[PDB]
Curated annotation (Swiss-Prot), chain H:
Fe cation 1 binds at H27, D54, E58. The chain holds residues 13 to 156 of 183 of the full protein. The gene is dps. Its main location: cytoplasm. This is DNA protection during starvation protein. Its EC number is 1.16.-.-. Protects DNA from oxidative damage by sequestering intracellular Fe(2+) ion and storing it in the form of Fe(3+) oxyhydroxide mineral. One hydrogen peroxide oxidizes two Fe(2+) ions, which prevents hydroxyl radical production by the Fenton reaction. It protects DNA from hydroxyl radical-mediated cleavage. Binds DNA with no apparent sequence specificity without self-aggregation nor promotion of DNA condensation. Is unable to protect DNA from DNase-mediated cleavage. One of its GO terms (biological process) is intracellular iron ion homeostasis. It is found in: Cytoplasm, Nucleoid. Induction: Expressed preferentially under carbon starvation. Keywords: Cytoplasm, DNA-binding, Iron, Iron storage, Metal-binding, Oxidoreductase. One of its GO terms (cellular component) is nucleoid. The 12 identical subunits form a hollow sphere into which the mineral iron core of up to 500 Fe(3+) can be deposited. Homododecamer. It comes from Mycolicibacterium smegmatis (strain ATCC 700084 / mc(2)155) (Mycobacterium smegmatis).
Length: 147, 146, 146, 146, 145, 146, 145, 144, 145, 145
């Protein structure tokens, strides 16, 4: 019942990460104009439904590992190690760029967390792993879209 | 231009209102334990969606009016005027209890904006009122425990 | 040869799964009173899952090169606990005893997982699965009573 | 009255189906060779069908006031036969040693139906269906002429 | 950075294993004949559909890692390490026999890579960890002796 | 049954042409990037399944005509008269360009194989005739985005 | 080229047949009266959609073959051979009988173009063999007295 | 009045008949990186205009007359020229189409300024279209 | 006024070759026995629904050309060029085999009718060419050597 | 002793169902005029049943140890009545003959069900159900009013 605390804490941050992410992901959708902003929409939409479920997968685990997932704004700014999204109603070319860097962060933490878990809660590692999969893939989608 | 500027601000306030709201529902969703707790799960769901999309409709007008909707963890706490949500792993009565409270101020705020518009924007008003309806009916349902 | 030791873990694991989707089918058979259906609505689906994890782990055994033993005599053989006592009763009563069964299953599954990191990651990724799912049904059950 | 005199049979008939179906899966994981999917395709519809019989004679013990034990121990205790022991083996084998298994079950299902004549009036007729159906499978299985 | 080049390198080698495989696989589909020969069909189609999938998967993965995949026949001979599948218009016990050995090659190699990535990129490892499960599964099934 | 062999030999050469085609096609799917890159995706998919289909159609044919179709890397190469596809991760207005070229040779040989089939087999010709249409068409589709 | 252009023409002439054919097909839908008039709409509706398809299939082909299918009206009145459906609002019969006569001079030309291509463009010919057999049924259909 | 109307309606019919022949025409002829953006914006609009013809045709049958829908009539009662543009780029065709629609929307606006003295019913069917046609032009002018 | 008279009759022989074939097929289906015997059922059945299908196409095509399709036991014995299926309740091998025999005849006759049509009727040709594809294919399928 | 001539009457019934559906499709490829689909519409689902009867009347000939003869020359042999005889002909002309067709079919079925009073079991629980839905069809004909 000791190590089960450390675990529930990495996942807690991750929850917030996802929440801020999927929140931001919606922010971009609304704030995109210029070129093929539709191509962006059709790219962000499924990333929102997914990143959203991730925050749900990550939540229930914390619940199971004897603890309460905090998914409120005030909460997801306490865990937040980085800063708010800055791009207003701008371009795809500036937005994808913004998102490129957002993921630079999400991708990393996720890694430096899957990396922190082996010895602790493996069932939880795999979760954050399968996630990193689609996480990293999307950040590429963002990149190719922009070359 | 300036009228549109203030309609936005109002709609920006509402945007955040909603965004905090649908983020809460999921929170109460992951943390509601109890005997018939699954009915809360069952009620949160259609709502979570309903709200998530209402946040969408308002972020359409803000942009329409030439202003940038802001639905990020900052924007929400920045123009907020309520607490977070104190309820953790708790009982059906516990959430349903504060969940009701949440929907009071939320509609209170809404009921104001709908009037704070009247003069200004008919269209954007004819919107928030509709929101107020489904926001009421739900609470009405939340208000009916045991 | 190497698989001859990993086959052991999985063969014990299977039988645990066989025990369970028998025991689990047992309580679903034996409950009366208050909330009748809500339980069969929660158990049925899990029943099918444990039969799944039974069928799967078995296959993985027949794959590594041994005859997966899945007969009653093959169960009690590797079983390391007493049978399931609770006969007819209520929901709050079975779910309570059911909780401790799982603690056992989870425990050993969790245990068997830690034992595989060095021998067969395939079989592990497969336990890792049943693990995370089973644990949900713990919390789930745990959360039906207050 | 005559109730607790009949139960000692519908139990050793519920467990009959239990040891029957559980063996089905066991064989299902071991039938190997040219037309092995042959066996696979014929076991699956029975497995569930025989599971449907474990149920029918599990409820008519709860209804007829009692608690049917569908657990490991509640099988090795009232087991009147021996554990199915065909390993990872050819269709040829399993189908044969599966003819016998069915013959014996249809042997009990014969004696018991007859030993429950001038007592119960519908339990016998429910049981008759299984005698009817379980028999039907043997035909198909007795097409072990390949 | 260097590591990613040695992950992409293994993943590229793995890719060619899937490409040669599903080509080989379909190839078999066309020449397996006899009595219950459709069995081989009914058996093969999903594996081909699956191996082809894994290809796209491990490919997209290399793409994600900053190296670009190679699905061309020159690229799969340029990093194979075994000769083309042999059997032509033959029997079930003939193809299945060889196809076993083929998969011996696949799995044995897939395992190598898993253990070899265990110290580089678990994400990619999860990817192979998964396939491995299925590949080995087919192997068993192929062993309708 | 001496001219049938000649037909087959043509079809086999056609076979490897398709195989190299669909492998190459997916190879571009995986590498094409830029703003409109998903567009190329969208055009390539229906083609890739189409081609894979032809590959099947032709083999089945050879096999029918009493010869044995070859679908392995060597085979593809052995009867290949062209250069391996050469673009890596690259722009649309690049992959389509090189892909435009690939197709000319495909269509060229497909025309040739047709004419050569004139006095040989109208059936094989009719098959190849069909493909030619969806292949020639696809190239227009390729040289329109250019 | 040298020839491909000639093909493009046989095909262009065809396109206008098709266009002027569905312009006309619709024309009668509008102008049909009488008792069993819905028996007509019933058969026309799906043929209109079909003949528009063909128009496309042909247009995209001309496009594939070097360029510029022309589908405007001044382009129809041009490479047309026939008059112009003169029938107005009339008996089902009054139309079917007339329409029957239209399909004649279409199949007639469509048959010419096929023969005309056995030596020029085998791929395109395949495309007009597809339509030929279809339109021809519809005329048999129309020949429901 | 409805022979002064069955005229305007017929002139309208062909405007729609020409439009949708000409529309499917630019569809076949667009080329360049994103000619599909056009393909994907012509399609529904093509079914629409065909729809519009379909309608104004019924109207001409109701007022007890004959809808003329053959190439003959179209060239006859029209007052403009064939769509000039062949295989050309998207900016090329969109510009032409944007110009094509003025004529059609402009003419339609006229038949509406007329039908107000004669048959509001049709003058309504026409108003409907005008707005929808007006909107396609908008959508179309969005190109850069 | 005669181009058809020859062609149509040419299609009628074809039509009856099918009407025969699909009953024979159905015949075999009621007469295959022994070990597994169902491999045949799963094989034949789809094929009958195919042949019965071809029976129409060609009948309709006969009907479309101007003459009348005669698909009654009368014609299928008259324009026949062989003898009835001579196999009763027998094994798969001796049956599937004898069925292979039937196909040789059906393909050879068709190939002939396909040639005869070269410069005569291409639509009726790219209709037989179509059947020959699936008819040859079956004969192969059949050949469970 | 009569066992061989009991099912003998079924082999008779067998071919009739054949001749019947073969006829149907013939009339089907030939019924024409204003409301010809009208006849098509009613004929299709019937052919299913009729062919099913020939499947059901064969699933029996087989069981009591006998070879079901379902070939063209088997019909004309164990036949009695007249080969059909109507091509491109009016709506009523076919319905009319399709009537008479069934009469001789209904007549015999009953004349056989009767000859099977003191003999076969499910046969006298079969040809009725048949004769039922057959006799049914016969009324469904009668050309409106």
């Amino acid at each position: 019942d000791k190590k089960a605390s450390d675990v529930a804490d990495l996942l807690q941050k991750q929850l917030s990460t996802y929440n801020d992410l999927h929140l931001t992901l919606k922010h971009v959708h609304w704030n995109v104009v210029g070129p093929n902003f539709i191509g962006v929409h059709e790219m962000i939409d499924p990333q929102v439904e997914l990143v959203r479920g991730y925050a749900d997968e990550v939540a229930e685990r914390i619940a199971t590992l004897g603890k309460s997932p905090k998914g409120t704004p005030g909460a997801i700014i306490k865990d937040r190690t980085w800063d708010d999204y800055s791009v207003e109603r701008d371009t795809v070319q500036a937005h994808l760029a913004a998102l490129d860097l957002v993921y630079n962060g999400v991708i990393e933490d996720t890694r430096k967390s899957i990396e922190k878990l082996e010895d602790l809660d493996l069932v939880s590692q795999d979760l954050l792993i399968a996630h990193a999969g689609e996480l990293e893939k999307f950040q590429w989608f963002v990149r190719a879209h922009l070359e």
